Amino acid sequence: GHMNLTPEERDARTVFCMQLAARIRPRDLEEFFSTVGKVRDVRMISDRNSRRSKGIAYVEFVDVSSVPLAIGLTGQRVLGVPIIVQASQAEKNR
Questions:
Q1: How far apart are CA 67 and CA 13, in angstroms?
Q2: Is 50 helix (H, G, I), strand (E, B) or coil?
Q3: In what order do the strands lie in the sheet with 56-61?
Q4: What's the CA gap between 7 and 23, in Å, rounded?
Q5: CATH number of the CATH domain containing 83
Q6: Beta-sheet pairing, 39-42 with 15-18
Q7: Which residues form the RRM domain?
Q8: DSSP percent split of the chain into helix, strand, coil, nearest 5
Q9: What is the H or E stretch that residue 58 is in?
Q10: What is the span of the domain harbouring residue 22?
Q11: Closest CA to 13 of 62, 58, 57, 56
Q12: What is the Cα–Cα distance from 55 to 60, expressed in whole angstroms?
């Protein structure tokens, strides 16, 4: 349980989006959440190198409660682009 929020908790609202298509746009992820949510910014790895994973992005949400929202979206697949439940959490707790 929380008691109060932290400034650094806002940093952690980001959602790691893995399993993505080689040819996804940055917007394809922000759209996919905007239907139920609000986006702060879009930190898509510029996946053009043609030799790495080719299926990753990090979307900054504006809201803590959209992290467990985004988890619940794992089994959709826009054009063939599902998302992992992973979140962009950290190996830290107080």
A1: 6
A2: coil
A3: 15-18, 56-61, 39-42
A4: 34
A5: 3.30.70.330
A6: unpaired
A7: 13-90
A8: 20, 15, 65
A9: strand 56-61
A10: 6-94
A11: 62
A12: 17
